[PDB]
Design a protein around this ligand. Structure first.
Ligand SMILES: *[C@@]12=NC3=[C]C([C])=C([C])[C]=C3N([C][C]([O])[C]([O])[C]([O])[C]OP([O])([O])=O)C1=NC(=O)[N]C2=O
Length: 107
């Protein structure tokens, strides 16, 4: 199982512009509270700041990244998210969108 989202790299904070049907179902949020916002709303006090830093750098460098984060649902309950980010580039070498595949690997 996996979910899928899209971020807009032309905007400075990479706001999500499209989320799959499982993303809203897995996390507990709805489009009205997801679109236009950075994905970071899923994090909490248990999220490893070293792992978050890896995604922050790969987004600035415009390269791919894969991390294991402790994300939280809308009801505060935790789940473990195997996140993979991939830069989508235009022909001129510039990054237009970031794409994310989230897998709930809490087992
Ligand atoms: C999040 N998924 C997700 C999907 C995409 C396509 C991108 C680009 C990022 C994420 N994040 C990370 C978040 O947007 C942000 O980049 C990081 O928090 C690091 O930057 P900051 O400014 O916060 O230091 C995802 N983060 C999650 O926790 N869960 C995901 O599903």
């Amino acid at each position: 199982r996996h979910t899928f989202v899209v971020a807009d790299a032309t905007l400075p904070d990479c706001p999500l512009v499209y989320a799959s049907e499982g993303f809203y179902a897995m996390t507990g949020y709805g489009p009205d509270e997801v679109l236009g916002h950075n994905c970071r709303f899923l994090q909490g006090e248990g999220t490893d700041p070293k792992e978050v830093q890896k995604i922050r750098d790969a987004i600035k460098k415009g390269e791919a990244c894969s991390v294991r984060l402790l994300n939280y649902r809308k009801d505060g309950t935790p789940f473990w998210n195997l996140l993979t980010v991939t830069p989508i580039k235009t022909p001129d070498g510039r990054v237009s969108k970031f794409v994310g595949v989230q897998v709930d690997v809490t087992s």
